[PDB]
Amino acid sequence: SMEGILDFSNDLDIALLDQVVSTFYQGSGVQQKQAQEILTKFQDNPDAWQKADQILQFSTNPQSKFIALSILDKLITRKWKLLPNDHRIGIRNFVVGMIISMCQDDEVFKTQKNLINKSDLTLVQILKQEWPQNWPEFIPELIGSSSSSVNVCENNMIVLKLLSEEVFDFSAEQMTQAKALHLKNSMSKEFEQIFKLCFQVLEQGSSSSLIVATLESLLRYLHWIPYRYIYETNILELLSTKFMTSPDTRAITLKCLTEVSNLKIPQDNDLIKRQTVLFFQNTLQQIATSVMPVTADLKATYANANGNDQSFLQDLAMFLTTYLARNRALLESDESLRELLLNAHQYLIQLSKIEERELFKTTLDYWHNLVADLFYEPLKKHIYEEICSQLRLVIIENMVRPTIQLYKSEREVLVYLTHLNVIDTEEIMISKLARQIDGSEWSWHNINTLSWAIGSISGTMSEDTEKRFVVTVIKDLLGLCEQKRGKDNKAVVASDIMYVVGQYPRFLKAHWNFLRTVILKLFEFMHETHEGVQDMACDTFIKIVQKCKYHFVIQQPRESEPFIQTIIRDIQKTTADLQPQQVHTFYKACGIIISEERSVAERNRLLSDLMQLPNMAWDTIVEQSTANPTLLLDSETVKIIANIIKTNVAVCTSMGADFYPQLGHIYYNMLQLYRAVSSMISAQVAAEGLIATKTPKVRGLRTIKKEILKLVETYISKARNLDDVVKVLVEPLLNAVLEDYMNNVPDARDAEVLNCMTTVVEKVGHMIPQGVILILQSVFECTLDMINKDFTEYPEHRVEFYKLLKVINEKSFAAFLELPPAAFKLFVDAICWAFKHNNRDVEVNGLQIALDLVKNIERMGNVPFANEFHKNYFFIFVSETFFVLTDSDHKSGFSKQALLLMKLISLVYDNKISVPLYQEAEVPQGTSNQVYLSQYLANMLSNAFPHLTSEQIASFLSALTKQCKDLVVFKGTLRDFLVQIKEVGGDPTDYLFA
Amino acid sequence: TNLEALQKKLEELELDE
Amino acid sequence: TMEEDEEVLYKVRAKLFRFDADAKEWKERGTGDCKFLKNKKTNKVRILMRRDKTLKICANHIIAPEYTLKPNVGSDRSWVYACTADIAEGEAEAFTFAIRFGSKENADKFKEEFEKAQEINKK
Amino acid sequence: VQFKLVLVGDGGTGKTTFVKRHLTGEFEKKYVATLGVEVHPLVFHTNRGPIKFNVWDTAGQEKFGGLRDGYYIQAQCAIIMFDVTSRVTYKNVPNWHRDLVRVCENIPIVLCGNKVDIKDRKVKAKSIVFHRKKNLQYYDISAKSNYNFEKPFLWLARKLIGDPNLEFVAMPALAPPEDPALAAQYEHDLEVAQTTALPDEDDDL
Ligand SMILES: Nc1nc2c(ncn2[C@@H]2O[C@H](COP(=O)(O)OP(=O)(O)NP(=O)(O)O)[C@@H](O)[C@H]2O)c(=O)[nH]1
Ligand SMILES: [Mg+2]
């Protein structure tokens, strides 16, 4: 029954509308839900705007009037120019009159702010259409009318604020370059009278609401107005004194002064420098006397969260960091400004103690700026010695686990601070360590934080000073661990001990007996059942190895053999209690060390010995499972095989090219294993259906295949002997994977096959032209059919497919020249299919392939294939690119859409296409490609955007073709087009902007 | 002795009781 | 929490699923600690599972001796069983539940704890 | 004690997925765009009693915007969502914020960067600063991995109740209760359930 308002044959029941509206805002359940769909359809009715004036006049529901203004807004925004002229002046007079009526009635001006703000915004949308060319007295009459009442003067500040935002802050995408410039120039011409009205209100009081609304509009002006209005008036004195005292105006005034700390000023004038000093001095004075003194505990204040204290402290941090990052040099030389400089930094110190992640990052960014300058700029660090001493403690106590980005910022600041005063940093850290020992500050979180801070300054002290520091730290940490009771406490401290020693490789490298003791200790921890310890021991082991590998490969003094031989020898007992992932990390670490041995025979011997246990287990299964293939369904057998291949992956990851001897030991049997597993998966799908691909048994089998491919990928991506890859590796690999991929049902095809082929083509693609052809033959058409029905199925295959086509188009373009014409047509379809994806991985690759394909065709010259390519697919690529550019569903690819389009258009206007792009009956003979290109595009846009005039399409195409060598201007013309198609009656002269 | 005692003290690092 | 008069026999990390029959689809219901709560006055065992962080209840039903744990075709670390009265979101409703664990060992250990509770609930 | 929460952001940023995860605990893998708005009651249990959010999950796509800023009237708090794998969704954050605060001039707002579970992150943490001058709370969240998924509501609850020490507490767990005419019915539903594989079998849980 509520669907009574959607019938516009009758007259609108205003009382019924007010009930439907309140049912949607105050109701619930199904009543609210279908009242929602009714209000949407009422609003989306193209004629509803005609019924907006009786709603705004007769309705008793402010929400109904809000919705009526929304319907008006859509009309003013999209169809204003299509209206008869008398309607435009009627709407304009109606809105002006209603706003005046709402400001006179004090109970509606006070209790209906949403409606007035929405009305002010609707008025601003009209000014964007009519002002100033058909409304040149708006600003003089706004100022005159402001002197009448206080409610109008305050409301005029709201209109001006919203006007400033629409013209300067949000115009860049919402309107054309020409229309934006027109509006900016109009406000700029008449701002002299706007600033006079604003300044008079701020100086004469007295209504707080009128003052705040005036300050809010001043905030917006500061984004663009010339500097003279700020420094050559008294307004800086008003902001930094009067308006800082009252809490009603404090928040907005602080934001205005923050923007002032960013204005474009002359760095030559000595008074502008004095005025920049003066308002900062006044602001800090008002804060110390009216808000809180410099000794106040801002951390507690922020945590109590009274009133707007949190937002004020956030705005104070923004103000101080912004001003001091730009102007602190103004305060560093004059001795009378020293206390002002240090109190301000002391407020930041107090602000930096607040428990608020995002606020801390804001202050940390400033500290980084400061301590970097004190590190490089002469005669500066001595000013801030007490500030920097406090900062050291703040950062040490707030050290985070090594957010990724936040730790790097803290480390860099702390490292700068250590350079500035090593001695002060040492005593603070040892003091904090002493307070961990006596128990006054003992905590798992506190001991970990301190250890991270100690480990972060590695490499900033002299090696000799570092030596005594490390020894003192490790000794005190060992005493801490010795004194605590329980494995929980001892594991935390032992973990911190290993973290610290892991962070000081210069110390470990100079003391082999200590380094050996560390490693032997980590091997003991690899048998610890307590959670986390085994993971920590393994992570520390590979971390230390990465930095001290040379000391494991050589024979240390008074040692009988390089320690790497001692590690490999006991590898079974060392790793016996580790989980498989931890064993793989161990083997990877050993591989790092072996690669340091540059004697080939000695490196291959260490590789053979390291791989001995997995090679023995491999030879067992290869003999056992090949005779006969039933064990490959045994759970335990599949797990052993996968863990053997993963061990090879881990070692190949750290050894790269040096891994080739071990790969040759298993390569042929591994590929045979790949075939056998592939048979069993296909057999299991046949016997049980597609659901078999989800069973544990098959997923274990696919893991084997994936790990095999990952191992091959890992070596080939890092190989140095590319010849051996081509003659030994590539051919048996293609025979093993391509046909199995092609002849499997879609649900059984491993997308990792495509990724592996991408790696092969990446490194040796220029050497295997026939191999690249066989890769396309086996995967191209069958994969395309999996992914060309929708945008959702087979997401992995989708991404790998276009990565593979991308590298083939780059490294072996001749493979596409060998495709039959029907297959090459599917190639073009698949490229355009990638345009239409919202998936960024597919979309970006698809546009890059199109751009690279055009360049591949261009470099062929005037030959039958290039000529035919243009006659067949040039306009396809032009029209498909225009489609994704203008459909509003692929905005993330605008930049690469523009460049591709610019490349296509520039080809025609550079006469790089020999053949005529038309058939010689379409158009009279002798017609240039440029003339036909404009005629094709004009017809295409006329049918795709019928609401455009012919003059708009012509002006747009004229500008676009002329600008196909200037990407920045070209893109501005596309953005202008994207604005004009959202509306009716766009000015065709807008395309003459450049 | 200072770095020798450190090495011995770490050698005795044990997690149990 | 209304867990005062109960003792914890078993606790395990788990993810709880419910079957949407009208959609041919499994749907997650919660992730957190699944506990075997044994009342000390009525001598009955129940399932209590709360979501991490929000602590909201995603499973609340007695380990009936008639329920049977059955494996899922795609998992060796899960059990599927029907539940006729669960009050995690109000009054008792019927659900086909699946519960998955971190490893096959925990799933096996859960099974041997689930029927041990079934032995207790029939006495 | 009820509060209206408007949730705004570009289409596909995961607004609806985030709400459903809090409503039912499920993770909806499919993108079905919201048409206008969907209102859902959401209740949390705190040490200060239960708090109820009336969540207005608005639509992100322009073609489905509906009443647009009409949904924001009388909102008491809000969440602005973007996708850290899509730079355009963070570029549009100021547009959503402008439209929002023009209606609601003084409400607590959380800015949320969703889908941090995805490896190839495109909007880097160092680039997310818009919340600073606007006094918004920011959180990295993931509806998929549940990373920080409770933080936006906890922070809003603390601001709305005005207690910074408010916490989520466990619901009181009542005692659960205790025919062969439906035995063949549940057996049929269990047969199809065992033959439908559980999603995300490679996850940790
Ligand atoms: N990897 C990942 N995907 C997510 C996550 N959250 C949501 N998604 C996915 O993002 C897609 C969009 O889903 P949806 O929740 O409807 O986004 P929306 O913002 O509500 N769309 P609209 O604004 O148009 O109504 C879904 O496919 C969903 O699976 C996440 O945390 N991680
Ligand atoms: Mg949605």
PDB file of N, CA, C and O in Angstrom, chain A residues 565-588:
ATOM      1  N   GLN A 565      81.442 -29.023   7.644  1.00  0.00           N
ATOM      2  CA  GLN A 565      81.560 -30.478   7.643  1.00  0.00           C
ATOM      3  C   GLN A 565      81.049 -31.069   8.950  1.00  0.00           C
ATOM      4  O   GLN A 565      80.413 -32.129   8.951  1.00  0.00           O
ATOM      5  N   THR A 566      81.308 -30.389  10.070  1.00  0.00           N
ATOM      6  CA  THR A 566      80.799 -30.843  11.360  1.00  0.00           C
ATOM      7  C   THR A 566      79.278 -30.752  11.428  1.00  0.00           C
ATOM      8  O   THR A 566      78.638 -31.587  12.080  1.00  0.00           O
ATOM      9  N   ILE A 567      78.687 -29.753  10.770  1.00  0.00           N
ATOM     10  CA  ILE A 567      77.232 -29.614  10.775  1.00  0.00           C
ATOM     11  C   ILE A 567      76.588 -30.732   9.962  1.00  0.00           C
ATOM     12  O   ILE A 567      75.663 -31.405  10.429  1.00  0.00           O
ATOM     13  N   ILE A 568      77.064 -30.939   8.731  1.00  0.00           N
ATOM     14  CA  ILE A 568      76.479 -31.961   7.862  1.00  0.00           C
ATOM     15  C   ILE A 568      76.587 -33.334   8.508  1.00  0.00           C
ATOM     16  O   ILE A 568      75.637 -34.128   8.493  1.00  0.00           O
ATOM     17  N   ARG A 569      77.747 -33.623   9.091  1.00  0.00           N
ATOM     18  CA  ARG A 569      78.013 -34.911   9.722  1.00  0.00           C
ATOM     19  C   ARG A 569      76.943 -35.301  10.740  1.00  0.00           C
ATOM     20  O   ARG A 569      76.492 -36.454  10.767  1.00  0.00           O
ATOM     21  N   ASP A 570      76.528 -34.363  11.589  1.00  0.00           N
ATOM     22  CA  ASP A 570      75.564 -34.633  12.649  1.00  0.00           C
ATOM     23  C   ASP A 570      74.158 -34.167  12.293  1.00  0.00           C
ATOM     24  O   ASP A 570      73.344 -33.937  13.193  1.00  0.00           O
ATOM     25  N   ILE A 571      73.852 -34.030  11.001  1.00  0.00           N
ATOM     26  CA  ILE A 571      72.599 -33.389  10.624  1.00  0.00           C
ATOM     27  C   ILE A 571      71.398 -34.251  10.996  1.00  0.00           C
ATOM     28  O   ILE A 571      70.315 -33.724  11.283  1.00  0.00           O
ATOM     29  N   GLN A 572      71.558 -35.577  11.020  1.00  0.00           N
ATOM     30  CA  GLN A 572      70.433 -36.437  11.378  1.00  0.00           C
ATOM     31  C   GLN A 572      70.083 -36.302  12.855  1.00  0.00           C
ATOM     32  O   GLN A 572      68.902 -36.214  13.213  1.00  0.00           O
ATOM     33  N   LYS A 573      71.093 -36.279  13.727  1.00  0.00           N
ATOM     34  CA  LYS A 573      70.813 -36.138  15.151  1.00  0.00           C
ATOM     35  C   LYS A 573      70.380 -34.718  15.497  1.00  0.00           C
ATOM     36  O   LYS A 573      69.528 -34.531  16.373  1.00  0.00           O
ATOM     37  N   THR A 574      70.927 -33.714  14.807  1.00  0.00           N
ATOM     38  CA  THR A 574      70.554 -32.329  15.086  1.00  0.00           C
ATOM     39  C   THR A 574      69.092 -32.066  14.735  1.00  0.00           C
ATOM     40  O   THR A 574      68.361 -31.442  15.514  1.00  0.00           O
ATOM     41  N   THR A 575      68.645 -32.539  13.573  1.00  0.00           N
ATOM     42  CA  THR A 575      67.311 -32.234  13.070  1.00  0.00           C
ATOM     43  C   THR A 575      66.283 -33.307  13.405  1.00  0.00           C
ATOM     44  O   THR A 575      65.159 -33.249  12.895  1.00  0.00           O
ATOM     45  N   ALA A 576      66.631 -34.268  14.265  1.00  0.00           N
ATOM     46  CA  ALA A 576      65.776 -35.436  14.469  1.00  0.00           C
ATOM     47  C   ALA A 576      64.424 -35.068  15.065  1.00  0.00           C
ATOM     48  O   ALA A 576      63.425 -35.742  14.792  1.00  0.00           O
ATOM     49  N   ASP A 577      64.362 -34.006  15.867  1.00  0.00           N
ATOM     50  CA  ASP A 577      63.141 -33.636  16.567  1.00  0.00           C
ATOM     51  C   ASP A 577      62.407 -32.474  15.913  1.00  0.00           C
ATOM     52  O   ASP A 577      61.384 -32.024  16.440  1.00  0.00           O
ATOM     53  N   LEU A 578      62.895 -31.984  14.780  1.00  0.00           N
ATOM     54  CA  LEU A 578      62.289 -30.842  14.115  1.00  0.00           C
ATOM     55  C   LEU A 578      61.142 -31.283  13.214  1.00  0.00           C
ATOM     56  O   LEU A 578      61.101 -32.421  12.739  1.00  0.00           O
ATOM     57  N   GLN A 579      60.195 -30.369  12.999  1.00  0.00           N
ATOM     58  CA  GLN A 579      59.144 -30.584  12.021  1.00  0.00           C
ATOM     59  C   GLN A 579      59.704 -30.376  10.610  1.00  0.00           C
ATOM     60  O   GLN A 579      60.734 -29.719  10.437  1.00  0.00           O
ATOM     61  N   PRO A 580      59.058 -30.960   9.586  1.00  0.00           N
ATOM     62  CA  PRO A 580      59.609 -30.867   8.216  1.00  0.00           C
ATOM     63  C   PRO A 580      59.939 -29.455   7.758  1.00  0.00           C
ATOM     64  O   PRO A 580      61.002 -29.241   7.162  1.00  0.00           O
ATOM     65  N   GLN A 581      59.062 -28.484   8.020  1.00  0.00           N
ATOM     66  CA  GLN A 581      59.349 -27.106   7.632  1.00  0.00           C
ATOM     67  C   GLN A 581      60.625 -26.605   8.296  1.00  0.00           C
ATOM     68  O   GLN A 581      61.385 -25.832   7.698  1.00  0.00           O
ATOM     69  N   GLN A 582      60.885 -27.045   9.528  1.00  0.00           N
ATOM     70  CA  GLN A 582      62.100 -26.628  10.216  1.00  0.00           C
ATOM     71  C   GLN A 582      63.328 -27.344   9.665  1.00  0.00           C
ATOM     72  O   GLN A 582      64.418 -26.759   9.623  1.00  0.00           O
ATOM     73  N   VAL A 583      63.174 -28.598   9.229  1.00  0.00           N
ATOM     74  CA  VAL A 583      64.290 -29.305   8.609  1.00  0.00           C
ATOM     75  C   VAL A 583      64.674 -28.633   7.297  1.00  0.00           C
ATOM     76  O   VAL A 583      65.860 -28.555   6.945  1.00  0.00           O
ATOM     77  N   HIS A 584      63.680 -28.128   6.558  1.00  0.00           N
ATOM     78  CA  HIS A 584      63.958 -27.474   5.283  1.00  0.00           C
ATOM     79  C   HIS A 584      64.720 -26.171   5.489  1.00  0.00           C
ATOM     80  O   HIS A 584      65.646 -25.860   4.729  1.00  0.00           O
ATOM     81  N   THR A 585      64.347 -25.400   6.515  1.00  0.00           N
ATOM     82  CA  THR A 585      65.113 -24.206   6.861  1.00  0.00           C
ATOM     83  C   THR A 585      66.557 -24.561   7.201  1.00  0.00           C
ATOM     84  O   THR A 585      67.492 -23.882   6.757  1.00  0.00           O
ATOM     85  N   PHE A 586      66.758 -25.628   7.983  1.00  0.00           N
ATOM     86  CA  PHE A 586      68.111 -26.065   8.322  1.00  0.00           C
ATOM     87  C   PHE A 586      68.917 -26.361   7.065  1.00  0.00           C
ATOM     88  O   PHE A 586      70.046 -25.876   6.906  1.00  0.00           O
ATOM     89  N   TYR A 587      68.347 -27.153   6.151  1.00  0.00           N
ATOM     90  CA  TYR A 587      69.064 -27.508   4.929  1.00  0.00           C
ATOM     91  C   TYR A 587      69.333 -26.283   4.068  1.00  0.00           C
ATOM     92  O   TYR A 587      70.399 -26.176   3.448  1.00  0.00           O
ATOM     93  N   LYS A 588      68.379 -25.348   4.016  1.00  0.00           N
ATOM     94  CA  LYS A 588      68.614 -24.104   3.291  1.00  0.00           C
ATOM     95  C   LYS A 588      69.793 -23.344   3.878  1.00  0.00           C
ATOM     96  O   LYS A 588      70.629 -22.811   3.135  1.00  0.00           O
TER      97      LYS A 588
END
